[PDB]
Every structure is written in C-alpha cells, then in structure tokens.
Nucleic acid binder design. Structure first.
Lengths: 189, 191, 184, 191, 175, 191
DNA sequence: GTCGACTCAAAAATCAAGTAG
DNA sequence: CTACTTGATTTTTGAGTCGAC
DNA sequence: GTCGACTCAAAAATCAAGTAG
DNA sequence: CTACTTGATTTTTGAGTCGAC
C-alpha cells in the first residue's frame, strides 16, 4: 500500500471484485475472474489480500467508510440534530439508489462472511450512538438510551432502502418526501 | 397444492414440518429432497406431488410463518385502547414472538438468497394489512399523517429483533422497554 | 477406489431390510456418497446383487475347500465340510441373507449357485462311491440331499436363531452324515 | 364372509391370485390383474383383503393345511417310522408336482412375507419333532436331537422339491426313487 | 473429452496470443475446464507445446505425400496454409522456443525440393543453378507470401495477383 | 539524453544489451545482467529506458537505420533496377555476416515485440513498392503487382539470411553468388 | 476424473537519497 | 336394515435420468 | 469422478354411490 | 539549479502445488 502504484493496483483488484460479486456472487467468482478484470497478475491478489474471504471484509469496510463520509459531508451544518437526521435520511436514499446493484454483495456477505455483516451495523450504530448522545444532553432530542435509538433510525433507513430504493425504480413522491420529514421531527421533542 | 383427502393433508404436513426443521438446522442447500422425505417418512416422489420444485417449499414455509405471526399480533391488538396502544404492544409482543421463533430465522436469511420474491412478499403483504389499519386510524384522528408509515414501523421491529433478540441473545432491559413506548407516543401524538 | 467400497459397505442395508426395502437413497446416504455416484459405478439397482454375490462365491469356495483338501474317507470329508459350512455361514450371515434375496430378484444366479455347487459335489461323490466308500446311489440325487441338509440347518440354526449348533447337536449331525453315507 | 355369496366371491379373488402370483410373480401381479382375471370389481379385493401382502398370508395358510392333510392320509397306514418317512418323502414330491402353483408362491414368501415363510417350517417341524421323538423312544429311528432331525428331513424334501419339481418338470426316475428310499433307510436305521 | 477440450482452446489461444501471452488459466477457462485438470493430463506448460508441434508435424508429412509443378504446388501450399492457419502460427513461435524444430522443418522441406529440382535441370525444364539455393528461394517466397497474404491478413491473394505470381515463377525458371 | 557524459552511459547500456540479448536470449537476460555488463547502477537502465521491452524497440530502430544507410551506399549511385536488386541482395547478406548479433535480436522480436517486427517488413515493403512502380512503366522490371513483388524479393533475402548466414556461417560460394544473380535477372526480364 | 483456492522463486519496476557539472 | 359391489379418483412408490461442479 | 434436483411409469389405496339380500 | 547516479526496496509475474470432493 506504500507506493502510489501499489495503492492503485490494490484499488484495481477491489473495484474488480465488487462488479463480479455483485453479478455472479462470491462462490462463482474465482481469483482468475478478479485479476483478469483488473488486468493484473494472478498472484497479485495474494500480495494485497490473505485469502478469498478477506476481499469481502475489505469490500464491506469500504461500503461503510464511503457511505459514512458521504453522509457526514451533508450534515456539517446546523447544531440541531433534527436537521442532521432530516438530510441524513433523504441523502441515504440518494446514495443507495446510486449503489443499487451493490446490495447483492450484502446478501452474499450474510452467507459467506456473516460476522463482517454484523460489523457494518455495529460500527454504523457506534457512530450513531456517540453522535446522538451529544445532542441528547443539549436537550434537542429525546432523553432515552442512545444505542437503542441508533438501531431504530438505522432500521427505518434499511427498510426504506428495501421498498422505495430496491423494490421500486420510481422512488418517493414529493408529498411522501414531505411526510417523511415530519415523522423524524415528531419522535424528537 | 393438492389438498383433497385428510390423508393427503396429513402427508403434505409431514413434508412441510420436516422441511421447516431441516432448513432451519442446516440451510436450503445442505437439505436434500431425500432429507425432507426421509424425516417425513414418505416416498421420495411424494414431495413433487405437493411441490413443483424444491424452491417452492420456501414459498409455503414463509406463507405459514407470515400468517401465524399476523394471527399472533392480531390476537393481542383487537381489544386495546386505540392505535397509540396498538403499536405499543404490537412491537412489544413481536420481540417476544421472535425469541419463540429464534431457531427458524435461519430460513428467512436463505429466503433473501434463494426465493427473494417471497421475501419481498413477506413485507408487502404485512404492509398491505398495516396500511388498512393506519388509514382508518387517521380517520379517527388518533394518529398523525399512509403506506410509508407502515414500512417505518416494520423497520423498527425488523432491526430491534435483529440486534436485541438474535445477536445479543439477552433481550431488552426494563429501562429500554419503557424508552420504546415513549418513541411510539412521540411519533403518533402531534408534539 | 474407496468410493466404490463405501457404496458396497449396501451389504449392511440389504441384509437387514432386504433388497426391496433398500433404496439407492438408503445406500448412497449410508455410504456418505452422492446419489448419482451409485449409477457411475452400477448400471441398475440389480447390478449391486451381482457384485455382492460375486464376492460371496469367491469368499466361500476359497474358505470351504481349505479343510476338505486332504482328508482320507469322503464320509470324513462330508462330516467336516458340513461343520465348516455352518461355521462359515455364521461368520458370513450378511452375505447369505443377500444370497437368499437372489431367489426372487435375480433367480438365474440362485439356480446357478446350487447347480454349480452340485457339480463339485457329484464329482467327488461318484468317485468314492465306485471305490466303495459311499452308498451306491445317484451321485446327483445324494449331492442335493447333502446340499439341502446344509441349507436347512443353515437357515434354522444360523439365520433364524443367532445361536448355532450345540456340541451335542454337532455330534448328532455327525452321526446322521455317517449313518446315511456308510454302506451296510 | 357372513354370506355364502361373500365366501363365493372371496374364492374367485383368491383362486385368480394363486394362478397369477405363481405365473408372473408377486411384484408383476397388480390388484387390477387379480380382479380382472377373477371377473370382479377392482375395489372388491379390498372388501375381503387388507392389502396385497395380506393375500399371501391366506394362500400360505391354505398351502400348509392342504399339504399336512394329504401327507397325514398316506402316513396313517404304516406303523414303522422308517416306512412312514420313506412314503411321506415320495408322497411329498408327488403333492409338489400336483401343487406347483402353491409351492411357487411359497418361494416368493421368503422375500415378501418372511414371517409366514418361517412360520410354515416351524409349525411343520413342531408336528414332526413330537412324531420322531416318540418313534425314538420306541427305538425305531436313531437317538439324535429330534428337532435337528426334523429340519434334516424337511431340508431334503424342500431341496429335492426345488431341483426335481420346480427347476425341472421331469421328476425322479425309478432308479432315483429307489436310491432316495435307500438314503432315508440308511440314515434313520440304527446300527 | 476433457483432454481434447483443452487442446482445442490451447491451439486457438497460442495462435492468437502466443505461447507466453497464453496462461494455463486462459486455456482452462476457454476450454471450460478446472485449472488443476490441465496438470492431470500435461505435467508441464512446455509439454502441451511439444504435443501441438508433434500434431503439426503429422499434418505437414501428410501434405508432403502427394515447371508447372512449382507453379501450382506454390498456390496449393498457400491454400493449405490458409486451412492450417492456427497450426502454422504456433510453428513460427518455435524459432525462439525450440529452434531445432524450426531449422529441421525447413531443412527437410529443402531435401524434398532439391532432389525434385535437380531432375528438372537435367531435363532442360529449369535453368542450371545450385539446387540447394533454388529450393530455399521457392521456400522463402512461400513463407513470406503466406506470412503477409495469409497470416498477417485474413483477405487472401486474388486471381489478379495469383496470375502475377505464376509470371514470377515462370520468368526465374524458364531461360 | 542531455550531456555527452550522460549519452555515454546510454550507449554503455545498449552495447551491453545487444551483447546479452543476442547471446542467451531476451528472457534469460536480466536488467541486473545488463547494468553489471555496462558497469553501471541498476536503476540507471530505467533512467534511459521506459521498460525492459523498450530496449528491443531502440535496438531494432538502430538495426533498421543502419541497414537502410549501408544498402543505400552501394545502390544510390546506379541506373538499372535489375542491377539495384543484384547489388542490394549480395550486400544485404554481406551486412549480416558482419552483424550476426543484430539479426539474432530481430528473431527474438517476433515473440516479444511482434508490433515492431511486423512494422519492419511493412516499411521495408514501402521502400520497395515506390521504387518498383517507377521501374514498372520504365520497362526495366516485369509487369506484376508492386506489393506482391516487394515481399517476394524480401522473402528470398530473409530465407537466405537464415540458412547461409545464421545457421551455417560458411556464407555463399562464388558459384552460388553468380547463380543467385541469374535468378533475380531472369525474374525481372520483361519477355 | 473434476475442481478452484493458494504458493513461490524469480526478476521486473520504483523509490528515497545521494553526487556530478 | 346389513351385506356385498362397483369404477373413477386420489395418493403413493422408488428407480433412473439429467446437467452441474 | 462427484454431486443432487427432478422426471416418470406405473401401482396401491380410497371412497362416493350404488345394488343385492 | 539541472542532470546523472546508486542499490536496497517494493511490486509484478504466472507457472506449478495443494487438498477436496
């Protein structure tokens, strides 16, 4: 990972892996299938990665960092948490629609590496707990358990991403977009 | 698919029950039609007399589980003091039901992979029978503004069962139990 | 070669529940082998009997002829031969139980076993008879008499009851073989 | 069996079964094959019989009775056990050719109804033992385990019945009949 | 079937890409067979080339068992080369990999040419020159025209250039 | 290159590369092998050259220019195209007897850089085609296709260059030298 | 017989860290 | 009333096949 | 060579719906 | 400042191996 070319090649393999696993799955994807996509040598996969299941771990970790950083970009504004959660919900549906064909990796994760599947949620919840408890003491949001509410807010985003993002190409209507914002505002008094 | 004689209904159930325990224990792949029919104590071919494909057993396993969860939740909600108290124990007893049906979640994981259409159906039928319950509750003025509200409440139950019932294997504390009802109260009463 | 041997070990199943009640699923499951792998090694369910009875004929004729190979009087050959048969058949209870299944499922093999066994018997019997060792009778008829006695006591005292023959009973049988074959 | 018409029709089904099972085999014969030959309704078989296997149990119980009676007929005259056995053996092989059908079915039994197969030899040996043992006390035949001798004689009859009655329509030549008469004489006559 | 499935994919890939630019991974995937299945049949990657070359030498000997002769036999060689495209391309690769086979092939092609050439010189059919040289002139002409008009281009020669080639053969052989 | 001191080290690499690639082949030749032969630092090779494969491109560029100029010396000052080919052929073979190592690397090119290999024959044909078309109308050489006759002349040169130069080293005898000229003369005589 | 993951000795390409002119 | 009779409907049965890894 | 879903050609059981005695 | 130099260091290569069905 030291050299600029070194970190480039690692990203050639990783971006090749996400396309194949999202199309044919983990089982069907061979190391040859990956390196041939990346246009690199066969043994180069084993230079950057320990084994085949280790690519999924690194795929999930990037499909967490790249999401959380994207959401933190649109939530650097107003000190009020209700405003943070108002944008953080709609922009999550915007990002999931961009990475629509990339949810099939999670299905393949719950099968082959289910431990790193639990990790994505627990790490997302960890940054939704410490960041939520800040606004809690500030009396902006409800004084309850911070960890408990994190899963409630994630669970809503998860289910919406299933129905309006994955199970429908149409998405959300303007009236429903407004309706959603009040639901967030209501359970934060 | 073919329910005429009570013996046919008996044999279909011998198959369906064996499938439920086997898929839960070792998954859809590791379970063979021989495993299903041997445990059921019926002819190998008999599985095909009632089920077109091996995949079609997941369809009827989900249907039976969905209907039995819908009845379990319909039982504890028909008496309650308006919609605000309906979602109060509707969520509460779902987390109790999920610990009773802890072993049989392995099936629902497989569903998302092998038969994702009946996985999609599970939520869409539950949402269709939730929307009717919310449309006439807004008509009374008990709860705030339709279909979107159904999925939101589903996702709360879905994720809490995933974490506090499945992963933690302990449950919810008395403190956290009370905290839940407040989220329900604040989300339905216009504050 | 282990996979074919895993399949063949079939013997346990057919001897206990019988050829009919034994399925390919039963055989392949017990063997811890794929259903289809049975058909890679065997043409049909019936072909397994042929291969089992192939081993059964080999195991027997080799063991049974080891003790009769040197004795003086043919009466002593039969007295011992009978004892060594009932002894072998207790050691190979499974293989015989499968051989019994043949009379319905592969009758041509069953009929052949007895006929080929009669040929080995008649050969030696006709010989000693002409010498004056054995009663002068039809060598083929007497051959089936001793084959019948062996098969019946094998059924009753080995298969139908795991016990066997008592030392007292063994002497009684030895007397029966002697009395019958010794010319007056 | 309450009516005389009932007993009449049962025999129609029974006789066709004997004729068919003997000819084509137990597996090859269907209930339709029996009822059509019998010239009766398909379902009528089930009015008199529990299952296809249950008809074997009745065919063998008649086979045991009819053979035991025929053999009692000729063995009653002689009051010399060696002569009783000499005749009984010939008379058995005679009855065998006369009842090839019934005996051919008895062979199938060892695989389809092994319980009644074992039963026949056991019932036959029990009646044989008490007869031989009494004749041993009279000092007519050798003093050996009577049960053992019962099976020795039974096994001879059975095997000769296979080779010289089933496997070949020929039978025993006068030389072979005389030779067999000697084998039984030499074997039972004490020295 | 598996061993033959390999060779078909193996020949088609080594022809287009070349021995080095073709990996066992490329071969097995084109053949629709497991990676390890290659090593079950062939003990080495060098060994599969030996067999393709051994197969090519069989096809060459079969053709070699058959003034105007050098005119038609020239066009018949290029017609054979177009039908054996993939196999000749693998033979060109031998020059670097196993140079002994490349040298021997041309040397044996010279022997058969020379003996048949020296008989026509005596008869007065063709002009008196070195028989070893004249043969290599005809060999080189074939190898070059086949390299350009058959191997480097899928097109061909055309009846316009076909007649022009016979005019080249005639002029250099008839005085 | 910039300095005459720097350009001095570029030729130290090239004149060491030629000596190794022609001897033990491109594959067996390493950068550590080249740099050590040049008596320089490892990386210095990459300072003057893009990649290992690019050294082949420069060596063949020099090989192409050196031959184009050497043959020009003896053919530039001529009138008859038939005689241009006669001199051109003999001096081509004379050049390779001196430059054996340079042609050996051109053989390695077919396998490692077939792009520059196919370019050489395609550009050598372009020099011939232009020169032939001028002599076609002048009545010097025979009336055929210019591209066809270009490769024909190339093929005779290429083949002889392997057999009498690379494989034997013995070269052509004075009888063979004269016999060859007769072939080229006969070929291009418009009869 | 079939499979596809993982090893390993080579030798490329690339640096940080210097010195010449 | 019970005792037989009917055939079409229904359920049952493994062995053998098939394309896949 | 190894794997397991799936077809298939019969059958055995049923049972409503009757007729005989 | 630029042009050149140095060699350990980091990356790449794809054949051959490895168990396991």
């Amino acid at each position: 990972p030291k050299t600029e070319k070194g970190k480039e090649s690692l990203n050639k393999i990783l971006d090749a892996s996400v396309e194949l696993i999202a199309d044919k799955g983990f089982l069907s994807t061979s190391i040859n299938d990956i390196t041939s996509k990346a246009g690199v040598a066969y043994g180069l996969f084993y230079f950057y990665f320990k084994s085949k299941h280790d690519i999924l771990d690194e795929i999930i970790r990037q499909f967490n960092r790249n999401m959380r950083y994207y959401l933190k970009t649109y939530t650097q504004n107003l000190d009020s948490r209700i405003d943070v959660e108002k944008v953080g919900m709609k922009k999550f549906l915007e990002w999931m629609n961009e990475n629509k064909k990339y949810y099939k990796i999670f299905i393949e994760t719950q099968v082959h590496r289910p431990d790193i599947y639990k990790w994505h949620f627990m790490k997302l919840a960890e940054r939704y707990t410490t960041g939520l408890s800040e606004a809690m003491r500030r009396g902006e949001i409800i004084n309850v358990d911070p960890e408990l509410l994190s899963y409630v807010l994630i669970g809503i985003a998860h289910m919406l991403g299933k129905r309006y993002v994955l199970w429908s190409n149409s998405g959300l209507t303007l009236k429903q977009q407004r309706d959603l914002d009040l639901i967030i505002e209501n359970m934060l008094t």
